[PDB]
Amino acid sequence: VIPILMGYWPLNRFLIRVYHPLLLKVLHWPKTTLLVAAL
Amino acid sequence: YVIFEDGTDPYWARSRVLEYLNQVQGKLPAGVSAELGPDATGVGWIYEYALVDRSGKHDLADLRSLQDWFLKYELKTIPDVAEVASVGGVVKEYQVVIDPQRLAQYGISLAEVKSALDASNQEAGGSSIELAEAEYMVRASGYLQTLDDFNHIVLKASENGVPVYLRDVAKVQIGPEMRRGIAELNGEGEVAGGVVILRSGKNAREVIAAVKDKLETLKSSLPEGVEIVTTYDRSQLIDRAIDNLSGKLLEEFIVVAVVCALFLWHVRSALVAIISLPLGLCIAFIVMHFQGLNANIMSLG
Amino acid sequence: DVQVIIKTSYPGQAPQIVENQVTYPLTTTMLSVPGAKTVRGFSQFGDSYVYVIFEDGTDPYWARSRVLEYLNQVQGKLPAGVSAELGPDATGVGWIYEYA
Amino acid sequence: ILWGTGAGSEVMSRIAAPMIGGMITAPLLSLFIIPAAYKLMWL
Amino acid sequence: SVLTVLWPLNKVGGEFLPQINEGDLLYMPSTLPGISAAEAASMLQKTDKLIMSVPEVARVFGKTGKAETATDSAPLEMVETTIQLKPQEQWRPGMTMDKIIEELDNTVRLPGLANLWVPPIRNRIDMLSTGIKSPIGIKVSGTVLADIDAMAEQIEEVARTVPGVASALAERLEGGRYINVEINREKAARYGMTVADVQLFVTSAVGGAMVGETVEGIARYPINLRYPQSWRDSPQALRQLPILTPMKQQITLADVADIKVSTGPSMLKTENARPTSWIYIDARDRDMVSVVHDLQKAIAEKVQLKPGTSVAFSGQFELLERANHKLKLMVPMTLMIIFVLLYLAFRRVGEALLIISSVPFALVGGIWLLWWMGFHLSVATGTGFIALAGVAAEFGVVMLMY
Amino acid sequence: VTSAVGGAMVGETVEGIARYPINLRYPQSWRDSPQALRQLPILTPMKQQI
Numbered sequence: 028v029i030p031i032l033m034g035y036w037p038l039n040r041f042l043i044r045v046y047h048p049l050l051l052k053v054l055h056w057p058k059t060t061l062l063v064a065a066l
Numbered sequence: 067y068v069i070f071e072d073g074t075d076p077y078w079a080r081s082r083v084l085e086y087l088n089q090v091q092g093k094l095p096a097g098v099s100a101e102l103g104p105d106a107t108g109v110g111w112i113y114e115y116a117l118v119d120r121s122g123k124h125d126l127a128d129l130r131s132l133q134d135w136f137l138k139y140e141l142k143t144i145p146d147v148a149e150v151a152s153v154g155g156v157v158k159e160y161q162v163v164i165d166p167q168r169l170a171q172y173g174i175s176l177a178e179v180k181s182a183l184d185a186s187n188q189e190a191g192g193s194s195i196e197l198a199e200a201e202y203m204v205r206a207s208g209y210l211q212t213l214d215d216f217n218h219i220v221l222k223a224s225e226n227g228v229p230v231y232l233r234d235v236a237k238v239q240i241g242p243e244m245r246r247g248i249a250e251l252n253g254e255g256e257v258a259g260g261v262v263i264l265r266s267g268k269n270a271r272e273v274i275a276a277v278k279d280k281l282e283t284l285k286s287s288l289p290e291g292v293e294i295v296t297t298y299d300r301s302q303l304i305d306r307a308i309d310n311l312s313g314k315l316l317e318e319f320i321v322v323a324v325v326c327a328l329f330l331w332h333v334r335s336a337l338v339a340i341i342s343l344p345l346g347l348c349i350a351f352i353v354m355h356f357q358g359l360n361a362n363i364m365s366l367g
Numbered sequence: 368d369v370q371v372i373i374k375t376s377y378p379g380q381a382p383q384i385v386e387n388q389v390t391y392p393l394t395t396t397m398l399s400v401p402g403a404k405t406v407r408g409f410s411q412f413g414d415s416y417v418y419v420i421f422e423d424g425t426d427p428y429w430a431r432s433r434v435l436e437y438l439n440q441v442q443g444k445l446p447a448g449v450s451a452e453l454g455p456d457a458t459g460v461g462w463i464y465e466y467a
Numbered sequence: 468i469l470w471g472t473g474a475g476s477e478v479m480s481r482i483a484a485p486m487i488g489g490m491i492t493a494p495l496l497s498l499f500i501i502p503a504a505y506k507l508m509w510l
Numbered sequence: 511s512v513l514t515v516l517w518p519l520n521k522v523g524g525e526f527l528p529q530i531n532e533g534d535l536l537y538m539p540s541t542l543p544g545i546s547a548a549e550a551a552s553m554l555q556k557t558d559k560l561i562m563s564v565p566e567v568a569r570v571f572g573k574t575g576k577a578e579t580a581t582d583s584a585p586l587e588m589v590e591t592t593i594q595l596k597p598q599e600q601w602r603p604g605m606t607m608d609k610i611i612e613e614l615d616n617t618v619r620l621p622g623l624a625n626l627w628v629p630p631i632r633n634r635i636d637m638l639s640t641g642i643k644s645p646i647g648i649k650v651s652g653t654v655l656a657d658i659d660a661m662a663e664q665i666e667e668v669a670r671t672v673p674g675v676a677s678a679l680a681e682r683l684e685g686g687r688y689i690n691v692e693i694n695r696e697k698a699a700r701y702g703m704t705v706a707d708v709q710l711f712v713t714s715a716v717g718g719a720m721v722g723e724t725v726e727g728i729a730r731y732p733i734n735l736r737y738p739q740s741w742r743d744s745p746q747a748l749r750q751l752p753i754l755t756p757m758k759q760q761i762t763l764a765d766v767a768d769i770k771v772s773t774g775p776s777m778l779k780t781e782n783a784r785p786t787s788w789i790y791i792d793a794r795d796r797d798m799v800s801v802v803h804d805l806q807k808a809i810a811e812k813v814q815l816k817p818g819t820s821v822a823f824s825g826q827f828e829l830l831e832r833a834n835h836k837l838k839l840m841v842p843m844t845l846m847i848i849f850v851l852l853y854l855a856f857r858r859v860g861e862a863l864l865i866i867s868s869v870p871f872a873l874v875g876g877i878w879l880l881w882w883m884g885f886h887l888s889v890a891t892g893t894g895f896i897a898l899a900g901v902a903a904e905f906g907v908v909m910l911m912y
Numbered sequence: 913v914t915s916a917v918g919g920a921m922v923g924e925t926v927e928g929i930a931r932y933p934i935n936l937r938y939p940q941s942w943r944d945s946p947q948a949l950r951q952l953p954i955l956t957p958m959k960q961q962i
Contacts, residue, residue, distance in 0.1 A: 488879025
């Protein structure tokens, strides 16, 4: 029903940046993130 | 009290407890009889009321009497009521108080008086005699009704003279029977009242409504100066609690709508997400109808 | 309909008594039986007939084991020697064959 | 079941009568009313 | 054309269900209460002699009072005789069951007895539904015995002034005669004797209370204990009634009890724990529904209601109303299903709404044939209609489809 | 003990649908205390006063 109804009829970029500076820093070394996780 | 394990038929459990109850009546003592309980429990205490009097005019032993023998059989009728139950008040009691000085004076034993009592409160009928052309039914009076009728209970009688009446060996006074339950309102007035007990598994709310209704019908019938102050109404919570969950459902709808609305910046699709909800309920409520589930904080939850 | 009869004899007792002491304490205590529609009952010369009609589609035998439990609750109340006796497994429509 | 009348045909007639008669006025009229209001409909 | 439906509609009548014919009918007559058992038997004989007099009756098994069963509560003088009928085929094709019935009506007579003729399978079903033995029956409730007796008495009168009605009777609760034995407690004490053992001379002597039972194997016969008929002949006979005091005194009954005739309850009917009083109406030529309307109005105007006293039409009509309601709102259903299922075929409300339109012509056609055949609007016809719509719409689908 | 000392109901007045108990008891005075019961008067079947 929803596909038929969907067929018939900014903050986000800042959102993205926010998560995408910490994302590459996490790959810097995964282990530590997991250590952090366990912690 | 016999508690049964999860998910057993409330009525099987009874026809069950009934067979066994039969097996045991022989064992247990002479005159005693084990009597089955009502079709409910303590949780079924749905609606309650006190029977107050604004004039001091009405007797507290007269008030329960009005309840036990009128209000009871008007409320018992009601659809899903397992039983309306009197609470407090005072039971009228014809209490004969024996005087020992009067028992030795006439040398009359108690077992005699007691037997004289048992045999002075009945009626009987001797079939039908055809007088005129029609058959006449034949009743013969005999019930204790007047306090006077108690006083002339023939005990000992002498050929050619005066009979000794119960009055000649005891004062017979209408008195309050020993209580086993005292009902009381605030600190203002000790009162008689009743409780409406719901049959297990029925709708308290609806029964309450029907109770209120029948009670407004019966107000025109009670003496002057008696008001029915309701003590416990269970329907209050029902309402308070049922609305609470209806509030959230709406609160959430708006919330989620506005959230989806914000993110999409497109009203149509913001609503396409939205419309998933109205239909959500409709499907949810259709299934409920079938399994046999109803609205309540828990299922609405 | 699914109907269950309670017959009770109160040997030699006016109707206005049978009703007060037997037919009425019985009719009122029977309307509150699960699945009961109406309760026709009338007192006689020394007899008491109470008829318990049940609402559409109720088990003819549940209605009986039902009317039986309650019948137990009432035997204590009603008069001394009297005993409310359950009716047959049928009704007036069950009058199939007859003979003289 | 409308005509023949033995034992129980009393009740079956009362439900056969409406259907029979009613199954004339409808089919008959339909023949003339359905082309009429239909031509008058499309255009 | 749809308009022409209004003339036949005004000629047809309304019954609950048709008159299903079984080759037996029981004659039940609303009969009054003050009578003896012998007077009941002689009536039972005489009646059946005439029930059996009518050419087409076959057997006649009369009955008064109850058969040994809780199913039957019938008191004496409540006649309930089963009439058996020789196959109607054998009668010369010159009459119906209604003439059969009509002859019976004129043949049996006997006032004090309002005689009613009903069919056995139907009467017992009607009975454990509403309670009324006749098809038409008014049912007056209330809490005050004598009041709802008045209403009944009035409606009894007003009811027979209606055309269709033949015999309209209303049973009076407060109308039964007693012999009252007011036992004076004082007068008892003097003679050293208790209200209990005074009643023994009333219960056994005057009456005939069974003091026990002879046992003969499986068999079991009662043991009576009574004074001879001579001292129990009349009220006066009882005033004389001899009694032997525990002190060996010889006294009459009028000595320890004043005995006075009186009236009161004959039988106490309580439907749903509220006193009821009834009225049996009998009409067999007129239309079932119509009569109730003439009665209904003949009562609303010429008979005002007392307090705490309500009247309601019962029996076959009452069962017709529960139907009608459910029956009537069946068309909104049927139509929606018919419209909806058509809406499916062509996806356009156009040809579906037109083809649905086929039925209002059906109704007219059938409702007319109803007139032609002197049939009545019954829960039967209503079923023929709800079936008609199905095929009427069928014919509308083929002319459209093709 | 049962009726005098206590108040056992020796039966019941019947008033239509209604039904009220019938007591049978000694006055409060002989049932006040243990000692009051030690005194409790009794009339023997041989008409003795004990």
